[PDB]
Amino acid sequence: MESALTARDRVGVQDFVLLENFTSEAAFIENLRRRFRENLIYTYIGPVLVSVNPYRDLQIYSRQHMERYRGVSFYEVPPHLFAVADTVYRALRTERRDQAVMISGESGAGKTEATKRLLQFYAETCPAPERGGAVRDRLLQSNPVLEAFGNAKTLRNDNSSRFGKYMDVQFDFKGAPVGGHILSYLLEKSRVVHQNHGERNFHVFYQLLEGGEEETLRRLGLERNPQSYLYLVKGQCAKVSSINDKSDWKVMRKALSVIDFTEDEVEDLLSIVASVLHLGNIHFAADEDSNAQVTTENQLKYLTRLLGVEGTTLREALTHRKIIAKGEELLSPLNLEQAAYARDALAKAVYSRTFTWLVRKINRSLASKDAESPSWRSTTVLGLLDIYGFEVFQHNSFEQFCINYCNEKLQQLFIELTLKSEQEEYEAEGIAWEPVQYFNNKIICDLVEEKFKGIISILDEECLRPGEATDLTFLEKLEDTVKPHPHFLTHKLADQKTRKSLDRGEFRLLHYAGEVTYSVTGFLDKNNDLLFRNLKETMCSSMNPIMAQCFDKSELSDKKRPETVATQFKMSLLQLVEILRSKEPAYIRCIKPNDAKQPGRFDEVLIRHQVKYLGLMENLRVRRAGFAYRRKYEAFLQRYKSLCPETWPMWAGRPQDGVAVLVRHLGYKPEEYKMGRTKIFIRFPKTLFATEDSLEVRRQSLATKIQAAWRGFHWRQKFL
Amino acid sequence: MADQLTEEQIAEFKEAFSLFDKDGDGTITTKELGTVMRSLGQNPTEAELQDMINEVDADGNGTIDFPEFLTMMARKMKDTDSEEEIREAFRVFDKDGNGYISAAELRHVMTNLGEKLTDEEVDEMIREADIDGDGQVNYEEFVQMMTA
Amino acid sequence: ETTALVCDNGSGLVKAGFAGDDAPRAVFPSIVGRPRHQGVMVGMGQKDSYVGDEAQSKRGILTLKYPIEHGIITNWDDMEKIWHHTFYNELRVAPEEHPTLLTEAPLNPKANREKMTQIMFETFNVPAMYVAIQAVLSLYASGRTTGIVLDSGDGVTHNVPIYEGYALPHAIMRLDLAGRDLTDYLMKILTERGYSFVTTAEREIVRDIKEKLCYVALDFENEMATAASSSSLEKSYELPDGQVITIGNERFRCPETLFQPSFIGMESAGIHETTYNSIMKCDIDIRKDLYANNVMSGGTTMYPGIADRMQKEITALAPSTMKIKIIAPPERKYSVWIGGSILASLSTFQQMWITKQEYDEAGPSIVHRKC
Amino acid sequence: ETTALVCDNGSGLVKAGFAGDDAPRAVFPSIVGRPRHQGVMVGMGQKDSYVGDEAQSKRGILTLKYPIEHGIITNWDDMEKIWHHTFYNELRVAPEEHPTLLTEAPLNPKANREKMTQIMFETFNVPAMYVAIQAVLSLYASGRTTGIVLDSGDGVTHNVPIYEGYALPHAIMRLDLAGRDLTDYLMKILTERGYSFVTTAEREIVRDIKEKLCYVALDFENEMATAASSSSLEKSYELPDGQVITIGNERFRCPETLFQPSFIGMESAGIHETTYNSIMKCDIDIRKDLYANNVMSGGTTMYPGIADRMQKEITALAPSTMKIKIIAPPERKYSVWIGGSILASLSTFQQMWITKQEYDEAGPSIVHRKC
Amino acid sequence: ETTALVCDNGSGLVKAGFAGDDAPRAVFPSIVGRPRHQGVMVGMGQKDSYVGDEAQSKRGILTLKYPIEHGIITNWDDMEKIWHHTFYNELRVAPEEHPTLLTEAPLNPKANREKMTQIMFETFNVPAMYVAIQAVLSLYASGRTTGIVLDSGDGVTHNVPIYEGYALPHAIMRLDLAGRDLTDYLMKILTERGYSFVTTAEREIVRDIKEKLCYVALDFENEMATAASSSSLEKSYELPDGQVITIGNERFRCPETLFQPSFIGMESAGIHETTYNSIMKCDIDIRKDLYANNVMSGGTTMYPGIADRMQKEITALAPSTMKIKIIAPPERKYSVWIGGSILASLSTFQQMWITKQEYDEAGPSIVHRKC
Ligand SMILES: Nc1ncnc2c1ncn2[C@@H]1O[C@H](COP(=O)(O)OP(=O)(O)O)[C@@H](O)[C@H]1O
Ligand SMILES: Nc1ncnc2c1ncn2[C@@H]1O[C@H](COP(=O)(O)OP(=O)(O)O)[C@@H](O)[C@H]1O
Ligand SMILES: [Mg+2]
Ligand SMILES: [Mg+2]
Ligand SMILES: [Mg+2]
């Protein structure tokens, strides 16, 4: 709203589209710094919200703020998290369509904390606080489990979220909370097998082996030292966490109990986690035609109990690729590569399916106790997607290649919905569309997707092509086929200046968040998810209740080859995109102002990175449109008519006519404004600044009129 | 200006002037011109009073006679601000168009803006502008009270 | 749908599916049967021709014919019924959606490729098509790009040597001897015991003996002397009418024909000497790697002991320091098709298809410019 | 970086590195190979050409061309690929950082330096370059200001007398016979026993015999009568495919062509008489110091017995009073490298480069004036 | 009798007679046929082996074996039967009367000359013998002391430059490509129309197609595009049972292999390049006299259009001022015979023969010295 515009010196703007020099990344960062040190931290970009982590117990999330924001449109009142929370609830009630918030940020920017504040706002504001409270309680109490199974230590943070967590609160036709949901998209399951230097595998393994209860570990092939297991050691990082695994394991065990896991499900679950260690410790040796054999029973004597499958079957499943053709089955033996991939693919599949079951067990628990069926009038949901940010380190690899493509696609949605929302408002107000240039991400989502030329469709060929194939041969095929595309570059294709910054065995992409260089070592290792029907047939024959729910006989009918992790990721993502395209989502973007976890330290180097990682300059350009500001003629005329005597104190024509003579009186030039079907439009916000400045000097006369009227009344009350 | 002011109006003016003559002072102070005009229900501004006083304060003595008070009243008597104009001068500050402003926001506009109320005049204003006795002025009803 | 059809026109079994499958979806014998007798009963629902397992179930009452002679399509009017049955009955897809990868043996006639292409575009309206040499596809299924493939189909056997993904086309050897030639020989051999087989349906009885009981002698003269002096090598099989067959030296005197084609009266040397002669026609440096990457595929390579025989024979023909290994995996019957599963899935293969636009520009002559 | 590149473009091995290195960082054959056959497997990462060790690996499918004829660059587009592989793949440097010292044999065609120069400025963009005479570098490697250098490479033999740093330009001898002309002779002489080698891929196998079995006779008619009458001189070599070759008098009839060029039909007398004539074309005052300092270098001087034969031969041509010596060090294959490394390391050399500033003024004509 | 025998053992045709004959008396194919089938009738009397015209009549029942591989005698026991048939059955003379002039290709194995010598003395008991290089003999039939002889036999092609009777043995070229590899390639090419040939008895059919129909294209792409678009180049040939072949561009794709050995996957240069590359190894003054006297001999030089093609090909390679001529007379199949007839008739040759006395002193090693 206009009420802030006198404070353009002290606070800075409320919504960055009103910035005059809107192409200045420096001025945008400076306005963020000003609001941050003033503690007025939330700011819009049109309907979008931007935030910065204050590291402090700011009273802005208090109940009096909830009841201030409840029922108030986002643009008439100042930015806070609850303004989007209320706006999504009003949209959910008014349109009757379901709606979703999307949270995004670098980890430590407050994504989880903001999600918790959104849920507390709904639980305290909405009509049934007991049922909303039970859904909030279970949604947030689920978190230690979904962290232990789904977070990991990277190069940059000790407890990063490696998966696109998602939630719903379920809402009825009346507007009360009914129940909820959890879904997890985009789990980084490559990490379950392989880690880069300084990174851990998923936290549950280190929490398990540190956690104690050694008699409970005694059923397993236990080792209290995590260096003992081939899937935990590759990152060289097991002990060097700043956060205490033993203490967190006890929190997660307590949470499983509060979540209504039975002691049998917990014992099965701990057996699966322990089995994933014993899957890792399998060593293969060759025979006559280089066919693989499991060398030792020392793993299998645990795996057979833990995964509930016969050892004579599992030995065969790990070392043979079954075909069924013309109704005869054909066991074909695996070489040492394919046996390693079959084991590691089994570990990825066992784990990610167990995690999907830890979600599904909660998703069936949060659901409606009422029948949710006619004469139940309508079902609705309020979504809270909690996806990982765009991600850059010293050595970006396959994991960050997929995460950054996911974020490129989430940007390619977010820009599309915002651009179309501006165009459709322009055409609704009868405004001719102002032609605008912006980084259309559809140019470069094609470089990663496109059916028989994108990087995924080539990385899936180098997993499949016969003979010798290597991470460098993959790179040499990119350089032979994507070659002219202006967003792709390599040390071969680079000029003699840029080739100093980009090595042999690397390629480079111009993502929305700027240019990122990928190191190909471990691309063909990580993309393979060879899980032949023999291993699924074996595992769905298991005695173990988890394995029996997680693999089933229906998949065994599918004649397709195993799909590679890049394709499994591409498909999982394209479902998340079409799930979000079904809605009109509200976006929350969060900035971590320093690594020190320190109040008031605005580290501009770290923020200039994040202002690029969160795409704020493209969004600012798109939502700034041709016109920086627009308003209903009635609301604009009511505020500013005092500047034009012909409209003062009230106007008798169309509100459009009153605004038209007001902009002639204010002397706006034909290029500085436009007249829409029911709204004013403004091309340069200096015009609106001068108009509130004009109203601020006009208020002097308004007060003088009131003071004179009061004194002319007062002297008739006390005398005559 | 708009009328040759006459016995019918002068009778009310002289009745009002008698409250400021009081015991026998015979003449009214230069700023107290505004006091007698405001007791007669005019809304003169302090700047308007000063601009009229600049053309009678030719030799000092701090005070003015009834004929020159009548002459300066004959300047102010042309027009006065309407109920709708004064209502709209409050309406610009309304939080929604809800009809209410806080007594603290009224105290702000009355003391941060030119021709300021004294703290005594604000407390006396709020004494009946706080119509519901809760700290909110209903400015539409308070303007219909004040512009009567 | 948009997936590539893949369709290995076996001379004995049709094998078809989509690129992305492991196994074929359609497998059926490459036969069109036609009724041999008067139709006695009205309203019984007799067809004028049957295909695949619809024909093989009606053996007694049909003249069985295969539309392929030695990997060459020899009757086109029946071959349109095979492909129609493949797409419409066995796969249940419309070919107008699917680009189609077909196969053939090397050194075949050019009339064969042209007329396969003309039929795919003009009778089935495919969007695009391609034809691949069968032994080349067998390397993709093997996971290898250096090696020599011996592929023994049903009407033909062929040897292709490939190094670093280059075929040596002068070192290709084609031998017109495989499982149907061995079957007609086993029909002759069994008359020595008194078991007589002569009808087109009885060839399928003797083929079913061969797929179960026949095996390759590690040393032929020694097995033959063992069978001539003991009963321990004899086995029995029950004919479709319940009569009991019993056979002995006839179990290995049948497959031995591959190593000794003079049992048919052919002149050209055995599949060991024919695999050696192609290695020994390659440029000397590659031969060390061809011996470490010999590959076998197609169902006529399935006999018990054939790879152990083959290793023993090439260990005699090759120099004594060469570490000869003969890859012959448990699925090897379907490997030519599994190569087509992979190839039609490759992204850099999607420029390689003949499109129907390139057919309209150049007619069926286009294939030789692409394949 | 700022270190000088040094780059002995050998007529058969490229030898490259930086000044101050003891030995070349890259040594690879001076070959560009292009594929001879139909590339059958799709998306294979197959290349239009392979360079050096890549082409030495894939021999059996590549036509192995050499861009250098007798030390003369005879194909420039392949030679640009050889320098590109040298800089970009083997050494892994940008030539714009590195002043580059090239070499050539003396008496070379006049344009070989000019076109080597133009390619270093107008294609690799070097900051500066120079073109040394190869045999002069071999004296820098020997640590001597006086000597006569016998250099025999793969393509050329040349013979430079130097006295106290004065190279005598009239007395230099050049002979267009070295290790390739011997390989193509051994390729012919081995047909006497039966072994036939004729492809460019097989030439590298006959070179690999030549490097491993051959030696120089101390007296040829004595060894020739010994080999014709006893098996005592024979040795055996195993081909890539495990065939065994055995050879006898062919072990020294190959190196003997250096001392008797008439086996190739050549006019000019051998490497002993060529060393004598270049000593003897120096005026009489210095010859005693040349006889005391016969420097050998380059890989054709590597045979067993050759320094003893050379000392025996030259003693029979010289006066009986002379204290003859031959400086054949163990490392003599790389002396042209070690000399290029020494030369480019000197303080007094750093003004004598040809800079791109001088090339931009004088054009490619500059190397005839600076070198 | 006292006349010398002359005996040009072809790699494919034996051509034999006496010195002073105009022509060979015996011309017959160099084949030993052994019966493939079980014995026909008691009292018929099949022989254990048949030679020459007997095997060429009895083809259907025989495994035809040629004992000569590219001019090298690869089976000796078969070769003794072929010489015995030549002397006793065809010429009808006792070899113990006749000094015997044998021939072989250049760059041949030394074991070949030794074993031919041993067999002529220790089995045929001839009084004396000599072992001439084939292309040299071709100059006597040509009536020239100077020329470069392109000889193409059945099994080998070779180039020998000779100047004023001096042979130039550094400039000889031997190519293991001739009428047999052209017949195996024509066997492959004919499969493209669908005709299959695989027995050695059927290679003798395809040899008659090569002799009757094939011709050298004067310009390959122009003939190729003409055959690819018009019917006038296609000819019909009737097989020995009445089946009719018709062939088009197969008529010149077979002969084009001589100019493009890469069709066999063979790397070595064409016969036009190989006739130039030997002239280019001759000393400069004589190249002018070789271009005036390129001599063609041996049956594989008979094709219609090969002289016109060859003169066009060297004209593109040679300096444009040179007068390239080619000598290709009607009799050029027999010029090595008419050569041996003249050489053995020379009075100045009668001291040249290796007598049995010299063999009794030196053993078979004598032909390393005398020839
Ligand atoms: N032990 C050896 N005996 C004889 N020749 C050798 C030996 N080692 C290498 N060679 C020969 O050395 C030659 C390479 O010498 P080099 O000086 O590097 O040649 P260039 O500089 O011309 O490339 C080749 O002909 C090679 O076969
Ligand atoms: N008219 C011809 N046209 C083409 N090829 C011919 C012709 N006459 C003979 N030949 C071929 O010439 C070869 C025989 O060459 P010839 O010199 O007579 O035999 P050899 O080399 O064994 O001495 C055979 O391959 C034969 O088919
Ligand atoms: Mg088969
Ligand atoms: Mg050298
Ligand atoms: Mg001949």
GROMACS .gro file of N, CA and C in nm, chain D residues 134-175:
model
  126
 1373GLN      N    1   6.903  -2.992  -3.572
 1373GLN     CA    2   6.891  -3.102  -3.476
 1373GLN      C    3   7.025  -3.149  -3.421
 1374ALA      N    4   7.122  -3.180  -3.506
 1374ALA     CA    5   7.253  -3.226  -3.461
 1374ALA      C    6   7.328  -3.127  -3.371
 1375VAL      N    7   7.308  -2.996  -3.382
 1375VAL     CA    8   7.368  -2.898  -3.289
 1375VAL      C    9   7.319  -2.923  -3.147
 1376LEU      N   10   7.190  -2.953  -3.129
 1376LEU     CA   11   7.137  -2.985  -2.997
 1376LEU      C   12   7.208  -3.106  -2.937
 1377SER      N   13   7.245  -3.204  -3.017
 1377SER     CA   14   7.313  -3.323  -2.968
 1377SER      C   15   7.452  -3.295  -2.910
 1378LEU      N   16   7.520  -3.189  -2.955
 1378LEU     CA   17   7.642  -3.143  -2.888
 1378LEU      C   18   7.611  -3.073  -2.757
 1379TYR      N   19   7.507  -2.990  -2.749
 1379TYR     CA   20   7.464  -2.934  -2.621
 1379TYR      C   21   7.433  -3.044  -2.518
 1380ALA      N   22   7.369  -3.153  -2.558
 1380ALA     CA   23   7.344  -3.265  -2.469
 1380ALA      C   24   7.471  -3.338  -2.426
 1381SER      N   25   7.571  -3.343  -2.514
 1381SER     CA   26   7.701  -3.405  -2.484
 1381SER      C   27   7.788  -3.319  -2.392
 1382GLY      N   28   7.757  -3.191  -2.374
 1382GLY     CA   29   7.837  -3.099  -2.291
 1382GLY      C   30   7.972  -3.060  -2.352
 1383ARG      N   31   7.983  -3.059  -2.485
 1383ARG     CA   32   8.108  -3.035  -2.558
 1383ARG      C   33   8.093  -2.920  -2.657
 1384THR      N   34   8.194  -2.834  -2.665
 1384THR     CA   35   8.203  -2.727  -2.766
 1384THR      C   36   8.260  -2.775  -2.898
 1385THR      N   37   8.320  -2.894  -2.903
 1385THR     CA   38   8.379  -2.953  -3.024
 1385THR      C   39   8.332  -3.096  -3.042
 1386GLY      N   40   8.298  -3.132  -3.165
 1386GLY     CA   41   8.270  -3.270  -3.201
 1386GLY      C   42   8.213  -3.280  -3.341
 1387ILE      N   43   8.204  -3.402  -3.392
 1387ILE     CA   44   8.125  -3.430  -3.510
 1387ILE      C   45   8.006  -3.514  -3.472
 1388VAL      N   46   7.887  -3.468  -3.507
 1388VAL     CA   47   7.763  -3.531  -3.463
 1388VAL      C   48   7.709  -3.617  -3.573
 1389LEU      N   49   7.698  -3.747  -3.551
 1389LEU     CA   50   7.619  -3.837  -3.632
 1389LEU      C   51   7.480  -3.848  -3.570
 1390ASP      N   52   7.380  -3.790  -3.632
 1390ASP     CA   53   7.242  -3.807  -3.590
 1390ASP      C   54   7.166  -3.891  -3.692
 1391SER      N   55   7.104  -4.001  -3.650
 1391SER     CA   56   7.012  -4.079  -3.734
 1391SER      C   57   6.877  -4.093  -3.666
 1392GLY      N   58   6.774  -4.032  -3.723
 1392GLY     CA   59   6.638  -4.035  -3.670
 1392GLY      C   60   6.557  -4.153  -3.721
 1393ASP      N   61   6.429  -4.133  -3.745
 1393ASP     CA   62   6.345  -4.228  -3.816
 1393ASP      C   63   6.351  -4.206  -3.966
 1394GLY      N   64   6.365  -4.082  -4.011
 1394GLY     CA   65   6.353  -4.049  -4.154
 1394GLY      C   66   6.483  -4.005  -4.220
 1395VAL      N   67   6.582  -3.959  -4.145
 1395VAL     CA   68   6.701  -3.893  -4.200
 1395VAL      C   69   6.826  -3.920  -4.117
 1396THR      N   70   6.941  -3.924  -4.182
 1396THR     CA   71   7.072  -3.924  -4.116
 1396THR      C   72   7.150  -3.802  -4.158
 1397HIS      N   73   7.202  -3.724  -4.065
 1397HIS     CA   74   7.281  -3.607  -4.097
 1397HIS      C   75   7.396  -3.593  -4.000
 1398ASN      N   76   7.499  -3.522  -4.044
 1398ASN     CA   77   7.631  -3.537  -3.988
 1398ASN      C   78   7.700  -3.401  -3.980
 1399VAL      N   79   7.700  -3.337  -3.864
 1399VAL     CA   80   7.744  -3.197  -3.852
 1399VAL      C   81   7.876  -3.188  -3.777
 1400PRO      N   82   7.985  -3.140  -3.839
 1400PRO     CA   83   8.109  -3.110  -3.770
 1400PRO      C   84   8.103  -2.971  -3.707
 1401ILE      N   85   8.141  -2.961  -3.580
 1401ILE     CA   86   8.149  -2.836  -3.505
 1401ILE      C   87   8.283  -2.829  -3.433
 1402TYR      N   88   8.355  -2.718  -3.449
 1402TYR     CA   89   8.480  -2.693  -3.378
 1402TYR      C   90   8.471  -2.566  -3.294
 1403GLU      N   91   8.488  -2.579  -3.163
 1403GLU     CA   92   8.474  -2.472  -3.064
 1403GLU      C   93   8.353  -2.381  -3.090
 1404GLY      N   94   8.238  -2.441  -3.120
 1404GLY     CA   95   8.112  -2.372  -3.144
 1404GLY      C   96   8.090  -2.322  -3.287
 1405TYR      N   97   8.189  -2.332  -3.375
 1405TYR     CA   98   8.172  -2.299  -3.517
 1405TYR      C   99   8.128  -2.423  -3.594
 1406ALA      N  100   8.000  -2.429  -3.631
 1406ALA     CA  101   7.948  -2.529  -3.723
 1406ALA      C  102   7.997  -2.499  -3.865
 1407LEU      N  103   8.064  -2.594  -3.928
 1407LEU     CA  104   8.126  -2.576  -4.060
 1407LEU      C  105   8.025  -2.612  -4.170
 1408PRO      N  106   7.960  -2.515  -4.237
 1408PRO     CA  107   7.839  -2.541  -4.313
 1408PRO      C  108   7.865  -2.617  -4.443
 1409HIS      N  109   7.986  -2.606  -4.499
 1409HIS     CA  110   8.025  -2.676  -4.622
 1409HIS      C  111   8.053  -2.825  -4.599
 1410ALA      N  112   8.097  -2.862  -4.479
 1410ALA     CA  113   8.137  -2.998  -4.445
 1410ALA      C  114   8.022  -3.084  -4.391
 1411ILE      N  115   7.906  -3.027  -4.356
 1411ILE     CA  116   7.787  -3.103  -4.318
 1411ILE      C  117   7.753  -3.203  -4.428
 1412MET      N  118   7.717  -3.326  -4.391
 1412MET     CA  119   7.665  -3.427  -4.483
 1412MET      C  120   7.525  -3.466  -4.442
 1413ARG      N  121   7.437  -3.491  -4.538
 1413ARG     CA  122   7.302  -3.543  -4.517
 1413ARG      C  123   7.278  -3.662  -4.609
 1414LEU      N  124   7.212  -3.763  -4.554
 1414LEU     CA  125   7.183  -3.892  -4.613
 1414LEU      C  126   7.036  -3.924  -4.584
   0.00000   0.00000   0.00000
